[PDB]
Amino acid sequence: ARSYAEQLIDTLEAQGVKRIYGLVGDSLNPIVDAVRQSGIEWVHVRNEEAAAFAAGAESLITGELAVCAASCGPGNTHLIQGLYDSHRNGAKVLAIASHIPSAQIGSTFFQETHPEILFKECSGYCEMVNGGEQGERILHHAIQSTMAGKGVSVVVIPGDIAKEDAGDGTYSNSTISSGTPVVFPDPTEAAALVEAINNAKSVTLFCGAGVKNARAQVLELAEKIKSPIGHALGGKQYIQHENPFEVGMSGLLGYGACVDASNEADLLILLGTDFPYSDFLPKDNVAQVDINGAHIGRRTTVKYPVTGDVAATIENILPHVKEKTDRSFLDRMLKAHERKLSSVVETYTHNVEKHVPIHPEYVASILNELADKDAVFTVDTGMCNVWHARYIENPEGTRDFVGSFRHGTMANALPHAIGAQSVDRNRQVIAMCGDGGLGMLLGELLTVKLHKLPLKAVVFNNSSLGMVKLEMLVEGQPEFGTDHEEVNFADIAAAAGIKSVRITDPTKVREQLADALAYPGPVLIDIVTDPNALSIPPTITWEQVMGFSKAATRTVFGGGVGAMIDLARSNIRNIP
Amino acid sequence: ARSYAEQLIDTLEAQGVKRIYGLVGDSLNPIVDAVRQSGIEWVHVRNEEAAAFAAGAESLITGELAVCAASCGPGNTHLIQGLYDSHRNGAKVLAIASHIPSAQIGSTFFQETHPEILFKECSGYCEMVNGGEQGERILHHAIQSTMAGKGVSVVVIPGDIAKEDAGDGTYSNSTISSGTPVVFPDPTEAAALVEAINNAKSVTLFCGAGVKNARAQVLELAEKIKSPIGHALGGKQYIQHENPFEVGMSGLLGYGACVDASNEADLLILLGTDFPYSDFLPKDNVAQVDINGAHIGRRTTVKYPVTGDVAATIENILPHVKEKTDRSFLDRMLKAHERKLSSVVETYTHNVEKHVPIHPEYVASILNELADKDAVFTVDTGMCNVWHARYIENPEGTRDFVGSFRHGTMANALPHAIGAQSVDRNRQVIAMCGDGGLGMLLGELLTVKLHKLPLKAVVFNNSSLGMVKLEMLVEGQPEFGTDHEEVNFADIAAAAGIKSVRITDPTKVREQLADALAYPGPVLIDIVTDPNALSIPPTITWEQVMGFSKAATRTVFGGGVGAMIDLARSNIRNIP
Amino acid sequence: ARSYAEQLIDTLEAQGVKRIYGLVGDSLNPIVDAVRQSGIEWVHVRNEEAAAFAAGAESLITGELAVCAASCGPGNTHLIQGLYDSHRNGAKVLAIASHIPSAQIGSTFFQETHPEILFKECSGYCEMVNGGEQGERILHHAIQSTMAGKGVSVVVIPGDIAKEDAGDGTYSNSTISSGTPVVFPDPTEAAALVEAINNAKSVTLFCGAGVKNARAQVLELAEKIKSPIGHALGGKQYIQHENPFEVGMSGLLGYGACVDASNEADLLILLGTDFPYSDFLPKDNVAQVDINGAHIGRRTTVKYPVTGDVAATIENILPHVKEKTDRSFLDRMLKAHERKLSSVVETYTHNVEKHVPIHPEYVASILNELADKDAVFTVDTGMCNVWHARYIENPEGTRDFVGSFRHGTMANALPHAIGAQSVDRNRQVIAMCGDGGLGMLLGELLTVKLHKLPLKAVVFNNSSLGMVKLEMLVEGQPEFGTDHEEVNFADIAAAAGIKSVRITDPTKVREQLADALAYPGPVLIDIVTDPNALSIPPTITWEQVMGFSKAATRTVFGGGVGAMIDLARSNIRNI
Numbered sequence A, B: 001a002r003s004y005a006e007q008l009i010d011t012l013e014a015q016g017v018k019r020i021y022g023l024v025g026d027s028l029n030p031i032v033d034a035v036r037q038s039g040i041e042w043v044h045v046r047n048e049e050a051a052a053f054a055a056g057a058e059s060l061i062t063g064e065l066a067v068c069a070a071s072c073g074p075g076n077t078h079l080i081q082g083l084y085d086s087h088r089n090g091a092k093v094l095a096i097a098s099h100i101p102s103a104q105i106g107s108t109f110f111q112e113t114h115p116e117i118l119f120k121e122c123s124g125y126c127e128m129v130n131g132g133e134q135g136e137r138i139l140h141h142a143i144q145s146t147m148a149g150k151g152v153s154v155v156v157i158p159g160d161i162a163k164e165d166a167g168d169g170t171y172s173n174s175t176i177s178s179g180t181p182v183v184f185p186d187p188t189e190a191a192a193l194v195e196a197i198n199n200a201k202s203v204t205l206f207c208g209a210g211v212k213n214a215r216a217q218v219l220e221l222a223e224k225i226k227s228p229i230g231h232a233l234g235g236k237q238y239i240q241h242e243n244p245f246e247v248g249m250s251g252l253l254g255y256g257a258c259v260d261a262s263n264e265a266d267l268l269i270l271l272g273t274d275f276p277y278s279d280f281l282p283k284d285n286v287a288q289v290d291i292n293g294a295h296i297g298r299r300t301t302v303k304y305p306v307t308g309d310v311a312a313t314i315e316n317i318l319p320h321v322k323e324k325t326d327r328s329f330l331d332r333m334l335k336a337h338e339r340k341l342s343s344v345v346e347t348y349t350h351n352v353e354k355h356v357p358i359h360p361e362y363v364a365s366i367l368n369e370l371a372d373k374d375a376v377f378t379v380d381t382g383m384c385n386v387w388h389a390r391y392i393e394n395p396e397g398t399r400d401f402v403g404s405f406r407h408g409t410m411a412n413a414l415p416h417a418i419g420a421q422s423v424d425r426n427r428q429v430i431a432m433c434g435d436g437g438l439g440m441l442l443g444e445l446l447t448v449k450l451h452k453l454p455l456k457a458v459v460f461n462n463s464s465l466g467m468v469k470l471e472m473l474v475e476g477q478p479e480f481g482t483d484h485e486e487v488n489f490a491d492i493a494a495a496a497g498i499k500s501v502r503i504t505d506p507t508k509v510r511e512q513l514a515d516a517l518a519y520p521g522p523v524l525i526d527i528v529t530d531p532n533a534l535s536i537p538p539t540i541t542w543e544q545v546m547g548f549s550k551a552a553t554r555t556v557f558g559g560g561v562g563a564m565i566d567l568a569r570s571n572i573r574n575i576p
Numbered sequence C: 001a002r003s004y005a006e007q008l009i010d011t012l013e014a015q016g017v018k019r020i021y022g023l024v025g026d027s028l029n030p031i032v033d034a035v036r037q038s039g040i041e042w043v044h045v046r047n048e049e050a051a052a053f054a055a056g057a058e059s060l061i062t063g064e065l066a067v068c069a070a071s072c073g074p075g076n077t078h079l080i081q082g083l084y085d086s087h088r089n090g091a092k093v094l095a096i097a098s099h100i101p102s103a104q105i106g107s108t109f110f111q112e113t114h115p116e117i118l119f120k121e122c123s124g125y126c127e128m129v130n131g132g133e134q135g136e137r138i139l140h141h142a143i144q145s146t147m148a149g150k151g152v153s154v155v156v157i158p159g160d161i162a163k164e165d166a167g168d169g170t171y172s173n174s175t176i177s178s179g180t181p182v183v184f185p186d187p188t189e190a191a192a193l194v195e196a197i198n199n200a201k202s203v204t205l206f207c208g209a210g211v212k213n214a215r216a217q218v219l220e221l222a223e224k225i226k227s228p229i230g231h232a233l234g235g236k237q238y239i240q241h242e243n244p245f246e247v248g249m250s251g252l253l254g255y256g257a258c259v260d261a262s263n264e265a266d267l268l269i270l271l272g273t274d275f276p277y278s279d280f281l282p283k284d285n286v287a288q289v290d291i292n293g294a295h296i297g298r299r300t301t302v303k304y305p306v307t308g309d310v311a312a313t314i315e316n317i318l319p320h321v322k323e324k325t326d327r328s329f330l331d332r333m334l335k336a337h338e339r340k341l342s343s344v345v346e347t348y349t350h351n352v353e354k355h356v357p358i359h360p361e362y363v364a365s366i367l368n369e370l371a372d373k374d375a376v377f378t379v380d381t382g383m384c385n386v387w388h389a390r391y392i393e394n395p396e397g398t399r400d401f402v403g404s405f406r407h408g409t410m411a412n413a414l415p416h417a418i419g420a421q422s423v424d425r426n427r428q429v430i431a432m433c434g435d436g437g438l439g440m441l442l443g444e445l446l447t448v449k450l451h452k453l454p455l456k457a458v459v460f461n462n463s464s465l466g467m468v469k470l471e472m473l474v475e476g477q478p479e480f481g482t483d484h485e486e487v488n489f490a491d492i493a494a495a496a497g498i499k500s501v502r503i504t505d506p507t508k509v510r511e512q513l514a515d516a517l518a519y520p521g522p523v524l525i526d527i528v529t530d531p532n533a534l535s536i537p538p539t540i541t542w543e544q545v546m547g548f549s550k551a552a553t554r555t556v557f558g559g560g561v562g563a564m565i566d567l568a569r570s571n572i573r574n575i
C-alpha cells in the first residue's frame, strides 16, 4: 500500500471483494493498474450504467459488498441509473467515482462535474477525497455505511490524489461491522399489538421483503391465529412457496383473495412491507411491524405501530397471543382464493397456447417449468413484471430474483444478470428481457460475449413498450408512440458472437426453449410475442394506473396465473 | 389549449418546434397525446440519453429551440449525460422531465426521484410545475432562459398536473426574445487594448468559438497589425478556412506554429476562447476579449481584460490601432507553420495508404475529400477528436461540426447525428464513431433504421479504448483494460436492417467509402483500424495528459495532418 | 505572499479592498493574521449575518468589491441571510467562508457543514479550496465572477490549507475586468420597438433600477413621444427627482397616476424593471427592454422584447422614432397624478401633526426635510418600506438608498447602515429601523459603539410587527402574535454607550429629531409610533397582499404622500 490507489485496492481485496465492474479511463487509470496487480478481477462493461446495475445485482445475490468504478465527469455520470436502483434495493455497493484533477476543480475544466453533489439522492454516504490519509478514512466510512444497511456509498476521487501516498493504515486496519442486530420491539408497542390480535376475531398477515428471515415465525403465528397470508411483490419469493395460508398478492399486478382477505379481516398486520398502493389497503384497524420506524404508517392508517424485526417481534408476542380455534375466515378466504384463480385461468388463458403471435403468459408458464430449481431470474421493468409475478414460482425457496421493483427502471434485466452470473458461472441465470429494455442497453450483449457469461436472455419481443400500451388503453388515449417496426434480436445476438434462437411458432416454444436453457454458454432466445395480450377491466382509471387514486379498490389487471393454482387447490383439500 | 399538456404543445408548436425526441411512458402519456394531435413529430429513441444529445445537436445546427422529453423517475434520469453535453455546448434546449404524481411526492413512492434538484448543474433554469397556471409561467421562463443563452432549461412536470387545466395565456402569448445584442466594450478597457496593441511590435490572435460571427473583423485586424491567427478546437470550423494568417491549433492535439506564435509574440490576444490547457499559454503579455466577463483570466494571466463581443470590440478599436508595416514576425511564423506541417506529413504519413491494420489518419484524409462541401460531421470522444482536428476541413465554411468538446463524453456521435440529420434529410451527415462509443449506445442503430435517417456512420473499429491506451503509454503503466476481442459492427448493423460495409484492406478504403457515402439511405461503414497508430513523444507526462502540469510546453502528440497543408502552402506563395 | 492566507489578503489589498467585516475564529485565524499585517481594516461584528449585510451595503454604495469573512461550520452558516440579500441586490461581494480541516472532511467532525453546497442558491460562484495553487485560481474566478455582475461569490477555505504555500501568482497577477460593456440591441428587436412606438398614439414608460445610468436618455425619449414616466420601487431613486413627466409608482405601496397611465396608454414600455406584481401590469400591448434576456416577459405578456441596455437602446431607436405633437394623454395623466396626490394628502394627513401615538407618516415627512441632501437611507423590511416610498425623496439624486427590496428580509437596516457608514464617516447615514428588525439583530448596537460609527438609527417603535398586523386586517383574521409589550430602545442604546433620545409627543418630533441628527456621533432615536396607522381599502384581499392574486387591479394602500407633491404641482404649470 504505497499510493492511495494501491491502498484502496488492497483494502477492498482484504475485505473479500472479487471483482470490480467498470470502464477504464483518465483518473481511474492508477486504480485499474492496482487492480491488474491484485487478485481482484476487472470486469469491463460497454456502458458504466451496466457496471452499477451489475454491482447491485451481485450484492443482492451474495449479501456482501460489490464495487463499480468509473472515470471522471461523463464516466461516473453514467453510473447514476444503476446507483438509484441499487440504492432503492438496499444493495451493499461502493461506487468509485473518479474525478477531474483537484487543481482544476472550480475552473469549468474539460469534463468537470460535481459528483459529490449529484449522487446525494442515490446514496447513504457520498464524499470527496482531498488527500491520501483523508481518502483512507472516507473509504472506511463509505464501506462501513453501506455494510450497515444505509444504501449506496460513493467515494469521489480526483485522479491526481489517487497517485499520492496512502494513509498510515489506521482506518483500513479496522474490522467492518457487517452483522445483523436482533431488533426486539418496545414492550409497550408489543403489548398493544397482542391486545389488537386477541381482540380481533379474524386477522390477515400481509408480508413484504422484511419477512426474508422470518418464514418460520410468520407461519407459526398464522397457524396460531388462523390468518390468511398475502404478500407485496417484494415478499413473493419468501412467503408464497409451501404456505398453507397463501392468499396471493395485492396491487394492479395482484392475484387471488389477498385484497379481500386484507380488507375483510378485523385486523390487518403489515409485516416487513412498504407496499405503496394505498387504495388496495384498509384504514380501519391496521398494525405495522417495520425495522425502520420512519417507514411506519407511510402507506395507510396504522393504529398499532411496532418498530422491530419481524422474527423477533413474532417470537416476543407469541406466548401472549391466544390460540384462535375458529378457522371460518381462513377457510372462507382459502376457498375464495382458489375460485378467483380458477376463474382467471378460465377467463383469460383457455386454449391460448396456439394463438399467433405467441402469448407471453404461455411463454412464462413454460419458462417456470423448464428453469432450474435454483435459477436466478432477473426481470426487466414493464410487462415482464406481470409475467414474473403471476407465473414464476419459487418452489423450495432456492431461486433468486433481481428486479427494479422500487426504482422501476427499464433495461435492468441484462446488466442485473451480468452481475448475478459473475458470482457463480455454474448457476443458471435467466434474464426476462423486454424488447424496449434490451434495445435501451443493447451494447451489453458485447459484455456477455467478452466475459463468456452463460446467462440465458429470454426476450419477450412484442415490438412494443407493452406496459405503456396498457396505460393508454386504461386512459382511453389512442395508441401512439408505443409500437414500432420489428427488430430481430436473434440475428443481432448472432452478429455479436452469441448463440441465438428465434421462436415465432407457439407449438415450438417448449422444445426450442428447452434446447436453449440446456446450452452450455450464453444464449439469446428471441420470442415473438403478442403486444395485445392484455385484458383491462373498464373500471380501471388513469389515476389508478399512475398510483394517485384515493378510492378503495379491489380491481387487478386481467390475464391468467400459472402454477400457483396447484398450492391454492392443495390448501383447499387440506382444510380439516 | 384546454389542459396544461395541450397548452405546452401548442406553445412549442407556435414557436416553430418541429419535433420532440423522447420515449413515451406514464406521466408523459398526456403530453405525447397532444404531440399526436399537433403538427410536431414524435421521434422515438431507444434510450432517453440519445434524445437529449439529439436535441442538443439539432439546436446547434438550426440555432433554434430543440426539445427532448422523458417519463418519470428513471426515464428523465437517462437524459442527464445529454443535458450536460448540450449545456456545456450552449445549445438552446428545453427538457420536459415528466415526474411522479404530485400526491406521491415526499412518500418514497415507486420511481420517485427529485429531478428539480438533480438537474441543477446541467442547466441554467430548472423548476417544478405545481399547477396549470404556474406551469405556463415556468414554461415561458424556461424557454426565455435557454433562448437568451443561459444553457439547458428543465421543466419538471408531475403527471397529474399535465392533465389539469391550462393557464390563461398571459405567458404563452409573449414573444420570446431570441435576438443577438451588439456588445461594445467599456471605453477604458478598449483603450488599454489599443495601447497594448500599439506598444507591441508583434501580436498573435488566438481564436475560439466566440469568433463565429467575427471572421471579417478578425481578418481585417490581422491585415492591419500583421498578426498570425491560431485557434482553439472550438474555433477551428470558423477561422481556419481561407485565412491568410493561419498558424494552426494549440494543445496536445494541436498542429503547426500556433504554440510558437502565441508564446513568441510581444502580445497575445485571446479572442472568444476558453482554451483550458494553461501550460500551452504564455503569462507575460496577454489580452482577452470575452462576451462573458466571468470567463476572463480563467486560464492564464490577463493584463488587458475586455468584456465584449469580438466583432464589436474590433470595429471599435480599429481606427485607433496604428498600421504595422513590419511583417517579419508574420512571414517567419507562416514559413515555420508550413515547415512543421510538411515535416509532420513526412515523418508520420509515409506509406500510410498501404499500412495494415488500416491507419485511421488515412481514413480521415479520404473522408475529408469524399464528403459533401456542406456535410455535418459528428465526432465521438477519443482518438476520433485527433483525426477530426487534423484531417476534417471546412472549405467555404458550409460544413457543420457537432462534438463533445467541453463535457468530453464518449458515445455522442451517433445520437448527435440522429438530431443533425432530422433537421434536413437531403443534407449529408457523417458520424465519426469509436468502437467504444458505438458499443456504449448500440441500441441507437435501431433508431436510425426506424426513422430511415440516411446518416453515414463511419466506425473507426480499433478494438480498443484508443485514447486510454495512449494515456497508459504516456504514464508507463502496462496496457490493461483497454483492448478487447474484435466486434463485427457491419454484421450487427446488417442484423438491424441497415446497409453495411466492412473494410479491412487499406487499398479498398477509397472505393468502399465512396460507394457507401453515395448510397441513398442509412449506412454503417465498419473500418478495421490500427489501435497502435500512436506516436507519443517521450517527454509527455501523465500530468500533461490529465491537464494538471503547470510547466510551459510546446509538445503535441505525434501523427500527421491532412488537407490543411494546402492553405499553409498557398499562404507561402502569397507572401509579398 | 508565502502562505495562501497571505496571498489571498495581498490579492484583495491589490484590488483596493479597504476593510473586511467578520468575526475571527478557528480556521479564519491565519486569514485575520494576514489582515492585521496588511493595510486592510478588520471590522469586528457581533453576528456574522451583519458582516454579510454590511459588505452588501458597502458594495452598493461604492460600486466596488466588498468582503465578509467567517469561521468554520456555524460561523459561515450565519452569513447566509446577508448573502441572499446581497445576491438579490446584485452587490459585488466576496464571502470568505472558512472551513473545517481538510483531513476531517467526510468524518462528521465537530462543527462540520458543507458550505460549498449550502451557498449555491445565494451565489453566482461557490467553490472549495483544496490546495494553495487551486485556491489562488478559484479566488480569481470568484472575484472576476462577482465583478462581472454574477452576484455573490463564496470561497470555502479549509483552515489547514490557509497555512499551506501560496500559488505561483499566475491568477492573482491578472487584471480583473470591472468595466461596463455597452449593450446595443439586436436591430430586429429595435425595429419592432420603433414600429410599436410609432403606431401608438399614447405611450407610458415604466422604469426600474436598470434606468440607473440612463436618466438623460429616458427624459429625451419622453420629451419626443410625450410619455408619462412611472417607476417600480427599485427605479424611484433614479427617475423620480426633477422629472417633468413624473406619474408615481405601482404596487400596493404605489402612488399617483402610474397604475392608470400604465394601463390606459396604447403602449407600455418596461425599462430596466423586474416589477413582480403582475396584477398591476397590462397584458394587451407591452414592450420590455432588459439587459438580461432571461428576465424578459417574466411578469406579464411582452409583445416587443428587446435584449439590451436602456441608454443604448434609447439612443439607437431615437432617430427612427417620430416626434409626437399630441400631448393629450400626458397632460391628462399629469393632471390626474396631481389630483390623486392632493386627494391622498387631504384624506389621510389631516391633523397628522397632533395624532397620538405618533403617526409614522408625520415622522417620515420631518425626517425627509431634516436629513442631509446627500444622506444614505437604509430601510428595514415592513411598514418602513411604505414610509420610505411615499415620504423620502432624492433631490439632485445625491442621496443613496439601501434596503432588502427583493429578498425582503427584516433586520437589514442597522447592518446595512454599518457598511454604508464605514465607507465615509463624514457622510450622514439614517437607518429607518423597525422595532422587530432592530430586536432581531440587537447586538449590532455594540458594533456601532465599538467602531464609533456616527449613524442615526431612527426606530419607528410601534411595539408591533406592523406589516403583519396589516396582513391579518386584510385577511379578516383576529389580531394575534403581532403586538407585544413596549420595549425602550433609547434605554437599551444608552446602556450600550450610545447617545439616545425617546420621542413620545408628536409636537416634539421636529426639535428632538433636529437635535439628534445634528449630534456628532452615533444616536438612537426611539420614536413611539402608532401600530394602527393603517388605512386599507376594503377590496384588498389576502391573495393580493401575498402576491398571488390574478385579477387586474389598480388599488393601493391608503395613507398620504410627502414632498413628492411639490414636483406634481410644478409639473401642472402651463396647463
Ligand SMILES: Cc1cc2nc3c(=O)[nH]c(=O)nc-3n(C[C@H](O)[C@H](O)[C@H](O)COP(=O)(O)OP(=O)(O)OC[C@H]3O[C@@H](n4cnc5c(N)ncnc54)[C@H](O)[C@@H]3O)c2cc1C
Residues within 6 Å of the ligand: A207, A208, A209, A210, A211, A231, A232, A233, A234, A235, A249, A250, A251, A252, A253, A254, A271, A272, A273, A274, A275, A276, A289, A290, A291, A292, A295, A308, A309, A310, A311, A381, A382, A385, A404, A405, A406, A408, B110
Ligand atoms: C411495473 C411494476 C409494477 C408493480 N406493481 C406492483 C403491484 O401491483 N403489486 C405489488 O405488490 N408490487 C408491485 N410492484 C412493486 C412495488 O412498487 C413495491 O416495490 C413493492 O410492493 C414493495 O415490496 P415490499 O414491501 O416487499 O418491499 P420494500 O418496499 O422493500 O419494503 C420492505 C420493508 O420491510 C422492512 N424491513 C426490512 N427488513 C426488516 C426486518 N427484518 N423486519 C421488519 N421489517 C423489515 C423495510 O424497512 C421496508 O419498509 C411493481 C413494480 C413494477 C416495476
Ligand SMILES: Cc1cc2nc3c(=O)[nH]c(=O)nc-3n(C[C@H](O)[C@H](O)[C@H](O)COP(=O)(O)OP(=O)(O)OC[C@H]3O[C@@H](n4cnc5c(N)ncnc54)[C@H](O)[C@@H]3O)c2cc1C
Residues within 6 Å of the ligand: A110, B207, B208, B209, B210, B211, B231, B232, B233, B234, B235, B236, B249, B250, B251, B252, B253, B254, B271, B272, B273, B274, B275, B276, B289, B290, B291, B292, B295, B308, B309, B310, B311, B381, B382, B385, B404, B405, B406, B408
Ligand atoms: C479528447 C479531447 C481532446 C481535446 N484536446 C484539445 C486540444 O488539444 N486542443 C484544443 O484546442 N481543444 C481540445 N479539446 C477541446 C477543449 O477541451 C476545449 O473545449 C476547447 O479548446 C474550447 O474551444 P473554444 O475556446 O473555441 O470554445 P469554448 O470553450 O466554448 O469558448 C468560447 C468562448 O467564447 C466566448 N464568446 C462567445 N461568444 C462570444 C462573442 N460573440 N464575443 C466574444 N466572446 C464570445 C464564450 O463566452 C467562451 O468563453 C479537446 C477535446 C476532447 C474531447
Ligand SMILES: Cc1cc2nc3c(=O)[nH]c(=O)nc-3n(C[C@H](O)[C@H](O)[C@H](O)COP(=O)(O)OP(=O)(O)OC[C@H]3O[C@@H](n4cnc5c(N)ncnc54)[C@H](O)[C@@H]3O)c2cc1C
Residues within 6 Å of the ligand: C207, C208, C209, C210, C211, C231, C232, C233, C234, C235, C236, C249, C250, C251, C252, C253, C254, C271, C272, C273, C274, C275, C276, C289, C290, C291, C292, C295, C308, C309, C310, C311, C381, C382, C385, C404, C405, C406, C408
Ligand atoms: C415590504 C415590501 C413591499 C414592496 N412593495 C412594492 C410595491 O408596492 N411596489 C414596487 O414597485 N415595489 C415593491 N417592493 C419591491 C419589489 O418587490 C421589487 O423588488 C421592485 O419592484 C423591483 O424594482 P426594480 O424593477 O427597479 O428592480 P429589479 O427587480 O432589480 O429589476 C431591475 C431590472 O433591470 C434590469 N437591468 C439592469 N441594468 C440594466 C441596464 N443597464 N439596461 C437594461 N436593463 C437593465 C435587470 O436585469 C432587472 O431585470 C416591495 C418591497 C418590500 C420589502
Ligand SMILES: Cc1ncc(C[n+]2csc(CCOP(=O)(O)OP(=O)(O)O)c2C)c(N)n1
Residues within 6 Å of the ligand: A380, A381, A382, A383, A384, A408, A409, A410, A411, A433, A434, A435, A436, A437, A438, A460, A462, A464, A465, A466, A467, A468, B023, B024, B025, B026, B071, B074, B075, B078
Ligand atoms: C428508463 C425508463 N424509461 C421509461 C420508463 C417507462 N416505462 C415503464 S415500462 C415501459 C415499457 C417497457 O417496454 P419493454 O421493455 O419492451 O417491456 P414490455 O412492457 O413491452 O414487456 C416504459 C416506457 C422506465 N420505467 N424507465
Ligand SMILES: Cc1ncc(C[n+]2csc(CCOP(=O)(O)OP(=O)(O)O)c2C)c(N)n1
Residues within 6 Å of the ligand: A023, A024, A025, A026, A071, A074, A075, A076, A078, B380, B381, B382, B383, B384, B408, B409, B410, B411, B433, B434, B435, B436, B437, B438, B460, B462, B464, B465, B466, B467, B468
Ligand atoms: C462516458 C465516458 N466514459 C469514459 C470516458 C473516458 N474516455 C475518454 S476517451 C475513451 C476511449 C474511447 O474509445 P473509443 O470510443 O473506441 O475511441 P478511440 O479513442 O478508441 O478512437 C475513454 C474511456 C469518457 N470520456 N466518457
Ligand SMILES: Cc1ncc(C[n+]2csc(CCOP(=O)(O)OP(=O)(O)O)c2C)c(N)n1
Residues within 6 Å of the ligand: C380, C381, C382, C383, C384, C408, C409, C410, C411, C433, C434, C435, C436, C437, C438, C460, C462, C464, C465, C466, C467, C468
Ligand atoms: C427574517 C424575517 N422574518 C419574518 C419576515 C416577515 N415580515 C415581514 S415584515 C414583518 C414585520 C416587521 O416588523 P418591524 O420590523 O417592527 O416593522 P413594522 O412593519 O412594524 O414597521 C414580518 C414579520 C421577514 N420579512 N423576514
Ligand SMILES: [Mg+2]
Residues within 6 Å of the ligand: A434, A435, A436, A460, A461, A462, A463, A464, A465, A466
Ligand atoms: Mg416490449
Ligand SMILES: [Mg+2]
Residues within 6 Å of the ligand: B434, B435, B436, B460, B461, B462, B463, B464, B465, B466
Ligand atoms: Mg476505439
Ligand SMILES: [Mg+2]
Residues within 6 Å of the ligand: C434, C435, C436, C460, C461, C462, C463, C464, C465, C466
Ligand atoms: Mg414595528
